[PDB]
């Protein structure tokens, strides 16, 4: 545990498991008060909180289903209540847009319903979460969006997913120019394959694993800690001169 | 006289005016049969048809409202009927996804309805237009998506628009890998500022004019023919070894 | 044969064989007077000329060893003499920087001598060829540099070669901004593997072939015509709004 | 207090002043033993050493003229001697290729000597510095190449300089694939305008100042610490999953 982020308040969406959980634990380890958002798995969120507290950090869990904007509004209603109680204001410093879905389909298999849901959760929700954060973020804050190396490496069997993450990349680079006036940086992290349960079944196939492992310059799968450790830098004061950037965190996958 | 596209059949979406109309004229000049799609009133499209025919070319118009997928269905029902009678086949060769909208709003001004409409028209429609095209495209066909230089140059005042075009960019590179098995290429053209009747209000302010003029390395506004002339290469057999590419056609804007 | 480039004069470096020969034949086919430069293989250059003339075009061969700037100076002394005789001036319209070398070495195997030679031929010579072309090129001319997809796809066994082509890419994008004032476009073509004798021995190994073939979205090796057909567009008036761009002509290799 | 680099050994080239000196101070602050290389007179480097030591850190200086490969040889002969006595080993952990020059010239002003010197100092030297480093670098080491935003933003008035930095960019991405087998990462930092005593003449013109200031999304000139603070992340164990990347550290210049 250290004090790099002492005095700072972070919201991490989708922090009940996987990458978001790792990110949340790393930020709390560095001294931040962390809001652990969950979509519906409350007890997993509570576990993330428990782990943070066990290691001397401060965190709390709040739910919101982000599949509609009424969910975004709910996120901020709860965040406001908890932060007001704990800190005397509804202000915060670090926003991690991590929550997302990623089911596969080729273009010929993609239905309207599937497409619309991918957009609602992965592109629309982060945009509206940022929109509502603007009144709450302090100057010199940090916005980090979790994208995907699928925006750099062609995966036609995930085409709708890739498109939503392409929208996130353009959103990042575009907003960075406006929000730099307030000192707020906006960056994206593009993970490669990372052992989590968005891909537990996909990676269960040994062919798929071999492909996933060997594409990295380091000949291993990524771990949640690999992503969290880069997010910690982007969340910190040290990264003040890096904005609008799409940082690959794939272990040099497909160089 | 160019006969590069003799025997070819092309569909250009949103081709009543502006860039779409110019692409339609150019493709027809090169020998293609051109379906000129329009979203509302036929009169503009019918006048383009008359102009093409007066210059010795072949074209017809088809109306469909692409604000919903029902319009995509109607587009293809009409196209199938027209092509079967005109050519003995429902198959075609060249798909130009030009149809789109581009109103402005900063993130803080962007409503849910505004955002959903941008996605529906600019990302969802081209996606399902391609989906339905695949059973009709011949091998060695060409798909050209009209994107925007706004995906390379930050325009916060058009943020939802930019996001939609970034989604198109990712779709373009992703699908190219899949469709190469059929010799089909998929590319995007990224225009900068182009003079139309439609853009001529944003372009009325002489300050904005000066910015848009001198951003180009050639120090002039783009013209619809500048775009159409690059689309002609991408639609031709000569571009066979170029796929998945985002081709800037901005007169070297902001290099 | 056509007249797209009627009245235009082109110089193609390294046109005695391979890609440069293909480019030269395509430009002459479109009506250009083509200067066929060769390093030392005069009879192969004469064959390129013979082939062009057989198909109704106009061309001539001139030698210059580009391994030193005295070679560049010699190139232009001969070009000036021949063009003055044939046209009444030393002006021209299209410059193709194609000539180059590409032997392999990992970083640990690269000597100072090897490195220096790669730079002299592949980076320095094209820069100085362009420098000397500036007094000779008309307004609205075209500069096309042949680079390599090795600038996008990591090939550590060709590291010095890749670095020289990276320098070419930056040179292209940078000069485009200055030369746009005269209407002159500057672009690069990045080929993938193409069956020529820069890689005849490398591809003779069936393992290397399989890799070279299957990385393309089209599951074939590139042909010299694939490169020439893209160069014809970049050389033409149709490409006036495309400048500073690095155009992949690899058949969607490694998307 | 940061102890991120405790036990680590770093070499920073051209670290008498400017960015190199700032990186050296920061790395030493984080616990690294720092070799501070200088190209001419020792006094600047020795003063940095004194400053680091006064703040509790460990460092020493080594002189070598990197305008030739003989200087690279001399660098490593001195470094081997120093490290063996200081640490019991010739091995080290962190290589920062910062040494370079950056005089301006348009293409039409660029002499052969000017061009050759730029290559020798900016591309050839870092290449052979890495070559000689590989036998000395431990597994899980870090190589960080200081490049330039001029590879993303066209500066025709620095064209040879830009070309040299594009060569460094390509080398960075290419080598990352090779070196991942040893857990070694290779990345580049691309600064924008940074305030030094060295840049302060180009920056004296208030017109140029205004351009360089407002090009950033943060509307201020870069500072040496802005660069050093990102280098600290790339030098650390936390950046293990980031390799082959060109990280813009320009305060979001020209987004
Ligand atoms: N793992 C990879 O290989 C990989 C690669 C590239 C990018 N990524 C990206 O990394 C991020 C996290 O991925 P992950 O692998 O850690 O995912 P994961 O293990 O599936 O966890 C997803 C998280 O998102 C939340 N979430 C999902 N749908 C939601 C909804 N509709 N409303 C609110 N919250 C919702 C979940 O909350 P509940 O627990 O309540 O369901 C959960 O905390 C995503 O943006 C993903 O695209 C992952
Ligand atoms: N103009 C520029 O500077 C610029 C720059 C970058 C990108 N672009 C892109 O280029 C494309 C067109 O450029 P433009 O400026 O020439 O277009 P435009 O002049 O604005 O005309 C738009 C065309 O798209 C059709 N359209 C719009 N919404 C539609 C809908 N909902 N359903 C069906 N059709 C619809 C219209 O058909 P109707 O005639 O029936 O309305 C019209 O012909 C767009 O994708 C645009 O984003 C333009
Ligand atoms: N083929 C590929 O797979 C591939 C892939 C990517 C990029 N490229 C690029 O495409 C371009 C042409 O390649 P290629 O495969 O066609 O090469 P090639 O078959 O080896 O032909 C090279 C040409 O360059 C000329 N040349 C070589 N060294 C020279 C020198 N020192 N001075 C003057 N001229 C010299 C040669 O003239 P002489 O005949 O007199 O020797 C010859 O005409 C090069 O820039 C290359 O890097 C090729
Ligand atoms: N400053 C900027 O705005 C900017 C922007 C983009 C990139 N960069 C890059 O960042 C690096 C340094 O930036 P800077 O402006 O802080 O540097 P600087 O202030 O110009 O100082 C240059 C340093 O490099 C060393 N050096 C120069 N030529 C050398 C040679 N031939 N042999 C050995 N050492 C040599 C010098 O050592 P001595 O003290 O012994 O001379 C000096 O410490 C360069 O690679 C530069 O291109 C800077
Ligand atoms: Cl987990
Ligand atoms: Cl707590
Ligand atoms: Cl118009
Ligand atoms: Cl009609
Ligand atoms: Cl040949
Ligand atoms: Cl002749
Ligand atoms: Cl300084
Ligand atoms: Cl010392």
């Amino acid at each position: 545990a250290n004090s790099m982020l002492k005095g700072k308040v972070a919201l991490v969406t989708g922090a009940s498991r996987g990458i978001g959980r790792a990110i949340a634990k790393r930020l709390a380890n560095d001294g931040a008060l962390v809001a652990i958002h969950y979509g519906n798995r409350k007890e997993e969120a509570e576990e993330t909180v428990y782990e943070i507290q066990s290691n001397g950090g401060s965190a709390f869990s709040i739910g919101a289903n982000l599949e509609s904007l009424h969910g975004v509004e709910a996120l901020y209603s709860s965040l406001d209540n908890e932060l007001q109680n704990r800190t005397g204001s509804t202000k915060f410093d670090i926003l991690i847009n991590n929550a997302g879905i990623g089911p596969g389909a080729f273009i010929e298999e993609t239905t309207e319903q599937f497409f619309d849901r991918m957009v609602s959760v992965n592109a629309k929700a982060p945009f509206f979460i940022i929109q509502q954060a603007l009144s709450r973020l302090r100057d010199n804050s940090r916005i980090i969006n979790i994208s995907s190396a699928a925006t750099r490496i062609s995966l036609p069997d995930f085409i709708a997913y890739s498109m939503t993450k392409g929208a996130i990349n353009t959103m990042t680079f575009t907003l960075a120019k406006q929000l730099g006036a307030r000192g707020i940086t906006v960056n994206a992290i593009l993970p490669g394959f990372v052992k989590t349960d968005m891909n537990a079944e996909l990676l269960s196939d040994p062919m798929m694993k071999q492909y996933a492992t060997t594409i990295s310059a380091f000949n291993r799968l990524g771990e949640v800690e690999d992503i969290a450790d880069t997010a910690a830098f982007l969340a910190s004061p040290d990264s003040r001169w890096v904005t609008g950037q799409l940082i690959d965190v794939s272990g040099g996958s497909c160089l």
Side-chain angles (χ1 to χ4, degrees), chain A residues 1-200 202-255:
Chain A
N2 61 90
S3 50
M4 180 65 29
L5 304 180
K6 200 176 86 172
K8 307 288 192 181
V9 181
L11 169 61
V12 183
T13 65
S16 46
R17 67 170 170 289
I19 291 169
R21 170 174 284 182
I23 292 178
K25 287 160 57 164
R26 177 58 204 260
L27 300 177
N29 183 75
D30 298 355
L33 175 57
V34 185
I36 309 307
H37 160 268
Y38 66 92
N40 63 278
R41 301 204 180 177
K42 180 181 184 275
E43 288 187 352
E44 303 204 21
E46 285 165 0
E47 167 66 22
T48 299
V49 169
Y50 176 71
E51 288 178 3
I52 285 176
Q53 290 167 340
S54 295
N55 285 348
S58 297
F60 57 93
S61 44
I62 52 178
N65 180 352
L66 300 173
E67 274 152 3
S68 78
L69 300 190
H70 178 268
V72 175
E73 163 187 342
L75 177 55
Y76 283 107
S77 183
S78 295
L79 191 61
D80 283 1
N81 294 325
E82 298 281 352
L83 291 188
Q84 181 78 23
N85 285 355
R86 293 163 195 265
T87 77
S89 88
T90 58
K91 301 313 173 170
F92 70 115
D93 306 284
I94 300 163
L95 170 64
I96 313 293
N97 277 310
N98 166 79
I101 64 174
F106 288 96
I107 181 165
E108 301 98 325
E109 318 177 305
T110 303
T111 64
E112 184 171 10
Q113 194 167 15
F114 184 100
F115 187 99
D116 287 343
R117 166 149 191 261
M118 194 78 75
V119 170
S120 295
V121 183
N122 288 0
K124 179 170 174 186
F127 180 89
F128 286 104
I129 286 164
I130 291 174
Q131 189 193 65
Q132 302 299 127
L134 300 179
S135 63
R136 291 162 176 95
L137 288 170
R138 304 189 191 275
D139 286 1
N140 304 322
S141 290
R142 305 284 193 261
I143 303 178
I144 296 148
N145 300 316
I146 307 311
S147 182
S148 171
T151 68
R152 171 170 70 78
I153 304 169
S154 165
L155 297 178
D157 51 337
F158 291 82
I159 189 160
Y161 170 82
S162 301
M163 294 173 68
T164 59
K165 297 302 190 165
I168 294 293
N169 292 346
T170 304
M171 181 192 72
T172 300
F173 125 85
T174 297
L175 279 174
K177 179 170 188 187
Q178 177 181 348
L179 297 181
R182 301 192 54 196
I184 297 173
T185 67
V186 192
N187 292 295
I189 289 168
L190 287 59
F193 296 93
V194 172
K195 298 148 76 187
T196 79
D197 299 324
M198 190 187 69
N199 54 36
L202 183 71
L203 300 184
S204 70
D205 172 34
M207 278 309 321
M208 196 54 45
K209 172 173 153 186
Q210 192 187 3
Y211 167 80
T213 308
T214 64
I215 62 174
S216 164
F218 304 104
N219 192 33
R220 67 162 178 90
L221 295 171
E223 298 286 342
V224 297
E225 292 81 9
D226 297 313
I227 304 311
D229 291 346
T230 297
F233 166 67
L234 296 175
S236 81
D238 283 354
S239 65
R240 77 187 73 72
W241 214 231
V242 179
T243 195
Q245 301 317 309
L246 312 176
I247 307 298
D248 182 82
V249 198
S250 70
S253 291
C254 294
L255 281 165

Coordinates of all heavy atoms in Angstrom, one line a residue, chain A residues 25 30 54 82 92 107 109 112 118 132 161 189 197 201 229 247, unseen atoms left out:
Chain A
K25 N -8.8 -2.7 -6.8 CA -7.8 -3.0 -5.8 C -6.5 -2.3 -5.9 O -5.9 -1.9 -4.9 CB -7.6 -4.5 -5.8 CG -8.7 -5.3 -5.2 CD -8.7 -6.7 -5.7 CE -7.4 -7.4 -5.3 NZ -7.6 -8.9 -5.4
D30 N -3.2 2.3 -3.7 CA -2.4 3.5 -3.8 C -3.0 4.7 -3.1 O -2.6 5.8 -3.2 CB -2.2 3.9 -5.3 CG -1.5 2.8 -6.2 OD1 -1.0 1.9 -5.6 OD2 -1.4 3.0 -7.4
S54 N -9.3 -5.3 3.7 CA -8.4 -6.3 4.3 C -7.0 -5.8 4.1 O -6.1 -6.1 5.0 CB -8.5 -7.7 3.7 OG -9.8 -8.2 4.0
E82 N -23.4 8.4 -1.3 CA -22.3 7.8 -0.5 C -21.1 8.8 -0.4 O -20.6 8.9 0.7 CB -21.8 6.6 -1.3 CG -22.8 5.5 -1.4 CD -23.0 4.7 -0.1 OE1 -22.2 4.9 0.9 OE2 -23.9 3.9 0.0
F92 N -15.4 13.9 -7.4 CA -14.3 12.9 -7.5 C -13.2 13.1 -8.6 O -13.3 14.2 -9.2 CB -14.9 11.4 -7.6 CG -15.6 11.1 -9.0 CD1 -15.2 10.2 -9.8 CD2 -16.9 11.7 -9.3 CE1 -15.8 9.9 -11.0 CE2 -17.5 11.5 -10.4 CZ -17.0 10.5 -11.3
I107 N -20.8 -11.0 -38.7 CA -21.8 -10.0 -39.2 C -23.0 -10.8 -39.6 O -24.1 -10.3 -39.4 CB -21.2 -9.2 -40.3 CG1 -22.2 -8.2 -40.9 CG2 -20.5 -10.0 -41.5 CD1 -21.6 -7.1 -41.7
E109 N -24.5 -13.3 -38.5 CA -25.2 -13.8 -37.3 C -25.6 -12.7 -36.3 O -26.3 -13.0 -35.4 CB -24.2 -14.8 -36.5 CG -23.3 -15.7 -37.3 CD -22.3 -16.5 -36.5 OE1 -21.5 -16.0 -35.7 OE2 -22.4 -17.8 -36.6
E112 N -30.4 -7.3 -35.0 CA -30.6 -5.9 -34.5 C -30.6 -5.8 -33.0 O -29.9 -5.0 -32.4 CB -32.0 -5.4 -35.0 CG -32.2 -4.0 -34.6 CD -33.4 -3.3 -35.2 OE1 -34.3 -4.0 -35.8 OE2 -33.5 -2.1 -35.1
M118 N -25.1 -4.2 -27.6 CA -23.7 -4.0 -27.6 C -23.4 -2.5 -27.5 O -22.6 -2.0 -26.7 CB -23.0 -4.6 -28.9 CG -21.5 -4.7 -28.8 SD -20.9 -6.2 -27.6 CE -21.3 -7.7 -28.9
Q132 N -22.2 12.9 -17.4 CA -22.7 13.1 -16.0 C -21.5 13.3 -15.0 O -21.7 14.0 -14.0 CB -23.7 12.0 -15.5 CG -24.9 11.9 -16.4 CD -25.7 13.2 -16.5 OE1 -26.0 13.7 -17.6 NE2 -26.1 13.7 -15.3
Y161 N -18.8 -6.0 -31.3 CA -18.0 -5.7 -30.1 C -16.8 -4.8 -30.5 O -16.7 -3.7 -29.9 CB -17.4 -7.0 -29.5 CG -16.3 -6.8 -28.4 CD1 -16.7 -6.4 -27.1 CD2 -15.0 -6.8 -28.7 CE1 -15.7 -6.2 -26.1 CE2 -14.0 -6.6 -27.8 CZ -14.4 -6.3 -26.5 OH -13.4 -6.1 -25.5
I189 N -7.1 2.2 -22.5 CA -6.3 1.0 -22.4 C -6.9 -0.1 -23.3 O -8.1 -0.4 -23.3 CB -6.2 0.5 -20.9 CG1 -5.4 1.5 -20.1 CG2 -5.7 -0.9 -20.9 CD1 -5.5 1.3 -18.5
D197 N -13.6 -14.1 -16.9 CA -14.7 -14.9 -17.3 C -15.6 -14.3 -18.4 O -16.6 -14.9 -18.8 CB -15.4 -15.4 -16.1 CG -14.5 -16.2 -15.2 OD1 -13.6 -16.9 -15.8 OD2 -14.6 -16.1 -14.0
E201 N -14.9 -19.5 -21.3 CA -15.4 -20.6 -22.2 C -14.7 -20.5 -23.6 O -14.3 -21.6 -24.1 CB -16.9 -20.5 -22.4
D229 N -2.0 -2.4 -13.5 CA -0.7 -1.7 -13.3 C -0.5 -0.5 -14.2 O 0.1 0.5 -13.9 CB 0.4 -2.7 -13.2 CG 0.4 -3.6 -12.0 OD1 -0.3 -3.4 -11.0 OD2 1.1 -4.6 -12.1
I247 N -3.5 3.2 -25.4 CA -2.3 2.5 -25.0 C -2.6 1.0 -25.1 O -3.5 0.5 -24.4 CB -2.0 2.8 -23.5 CG1 -2.0 4.3 -23.3 CG2 -0.7 2.1 -23.0 CD1 -0.9 5.0 -24.0

